Nucleic acid binder design. Structure first.
Ligand SMILES: Nc1ncnc2c1ncn2[C@@H]1O[C@@H]2COP(=O)(O)O[C@H]2[C@H]1O
Ligand SMILES: Nc1ncnc2c1ncn2[C@@H]1O[C@@H]2COP(=O)(O)O[C@H]2[C@H]1O
Lengths: 197, 199
DNA sequence: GCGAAAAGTGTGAC
DNA sequence: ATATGTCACACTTTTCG
DNA sequence: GCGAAAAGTGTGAC
DNA sequence: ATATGTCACACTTTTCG
């Protein structure tokens, strides 16, 4: 609909998996769009520890926060979870496409709107739930979003305790002994893959 | 400017301190705007422990997360920190107000860009810093807010150690202690009103 | 500006 | 208290040419 | 579906 | 190896009518 006139004016690129689309602090000049695939947003403490803030996918805009004031820089990091085709438009041409048609600027804002809600939750979990709890929300919320494939009884999913470790914010081994205390307790089963029940 | 174009379409409302302007469950259908005053956004623990997410000052929009979808609830709480003339429109008259002068969709979206930056940072702080870390930072920030009196040396923040405990995610006593330590180092001076930068 | 009622705060071994 | 992190390395379990 | 690295992971007790 | 949460209430400071 609106997207094709939009998606026409962009330069399109294919990023191999694990590439770095965006760097923290780099000066924000380009908006992006995930035409194919998925990406990861994560930030970093000067002493190297990193935390995933979210997974983004086909349909979502990227690097939109730089768009509204200028001077500023990329707020987070965006790596390629897998291959992607990314339409890229300078802020400037986009600042224009909005003057022609108001619909794409909305299609952005809706996007930032649910992300400001999904993020605020994440603050509350970090502050109210102990790790064990955050991990069960992660294993629920993960095991549903499109990556997840319909297990007979309780969807399945592929995640490393390492990575659960950077969403929940604890470490592979604590993620470890706890996860098991779930299999035992009986609300999940796992072995490389994680079978939610 | 057309912000006035906006208010002249809106309808004000006077609130008093501590009054909860929005509540975490109800249906979003109005989009506030803070004429005069400050308000605080916070969520709650399964039993009441609050966690203030951010304060919102005059010239801010409130409850704009429903504006882009139907039948979504209000996601947090918002209580007047002070008195607040808070303008109102409704979702639809607002969209009707958009397809005409695109400007304020822009002025709203911009505020929602900052918020995700600030909130992203907060999740950095909770996940990376330890309490003295997070409390120093809270103090760097509030020292920087709009509601901060000037002091010869440093900024005079006015605040309740109970509040810092909420903002930061720690209990009341932990704040009291840390606050003490920082004074001993001569980094602040406290007594209800606090001064950041020695004293 | 008054103070009385309400709200805020330390303390310390687990 | 009570919850969670941090150590080394041989260990699985998953990678793919 | 072949094995061989490459990843990813469980110790425990401070 | 560690940090911060806990519990009660005299005592201190803020509120607001
Ligand atoms: N909390 C978040 N959730 C989702 N996407 C985010 C979040 N914070 C930042 N981003 C995205 O990550 C991008 C990083 O670069 P920009 O800040 O330029 O634009 C940002 C967008
Ligand atoms: N993380 C946040 N930062 C700032 N303001 C917020 C945040 N989350 C919600 N709000 C504001 O709080 C309002 C409460 O109701 P809505 O969710 O309808 O719209 C919300 C806006």
């Amino acid at each position: 609909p609106t997207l094709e006139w939009f998606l026409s004016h962009c330069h399109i690129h294919k990023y191999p998996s694990k590439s770095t689309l965006i760097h923290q602090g780099e000066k924000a000049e380009t908006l992006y769009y995930i035409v194919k695939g998925s990406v990861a947003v994560l930030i970093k403490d000067e002493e190297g520890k990193e935390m995933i803030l979210s997974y983004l996918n086909q349909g979502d805009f990227i690097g939109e926060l730089g768009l509204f004031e200028e001077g500023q820089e990329r707020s987070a990091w965006v790596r390629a979870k897998t291959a992607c085709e990314v339409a890229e438009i300078s802020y400037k041409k986009f600042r224009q496409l909005i003057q022609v048609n108001p619909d794409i600027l909305m299609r952005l804002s809706a996007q930032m709107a649910r992300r400001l809600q999904v993020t605020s939750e994440k603050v509350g979990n970090l502050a109210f739930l102990d790790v064990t709890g955050r991990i069960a929300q992660t294993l629920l919320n993960l095991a549903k979003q499109p990556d997840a494939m319909t297990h007979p009884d309780g969807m399945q999913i592929k995640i490393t305790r390492q990575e659960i470790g950077q969403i929940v914010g604890c470490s592979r081994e604590t993620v470890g002994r706890i996860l098991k205390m779930l299999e035992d307790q009986n609300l999940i089963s796992a072995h490389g893959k994680t079978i939610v029940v």
